[PDB]
Amino acid sequence: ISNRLSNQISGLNVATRNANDGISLAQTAEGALQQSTNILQRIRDLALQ
Amino acid sequence: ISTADGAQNAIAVVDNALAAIDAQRADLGAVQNRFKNTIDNLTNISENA
């Protein structure tokens, strides 16, 4: 049970890494879409002008 | 591994596969117990003889 269990623990650590990399990825997507958002707001403003 | 579809299926491989190593290490550990018990009776047969 200790070999399988240890292997599980290691997989869990790697999963912490992978999930956190996912948070950072989705963060990048968020920021890029903040800028596209600000732009498309701006384009709306020009249509209103 | 390089392909993702191989990344997960890999885990299936090494999962059913790793536990054969440990199935052996189990068996052999038991065999070492069998040795020790065998010896413990053995030196008794020696002393009684």
From Swiss-Prot, chain A:
It comes from the Bacteria. Transmembrane segments: none annotated. It is found in: Secreted; Bacterial flagellum. Phosphorylated on tyrosine residue(s). Belongs to the bacterial flagellin family. Flagellin is the subunit protein which polymerizes to form the filaments of bacterial flagella. This is B-type flagellin. It comes from Pseudomonas aeruginosa (strain ATCC 15692 / DSM 22644 / CIP 104116 / JCM 14847 / LMG 12228 / 1C / PRS 101 / PAO1). The lineage of its organism: Bacteria, Pseudomonadati, Pseudomonadota, Gammaproteobacteria, Pseudomonadales. The chain holds residues 50 to 98 of 488 of the full protein.
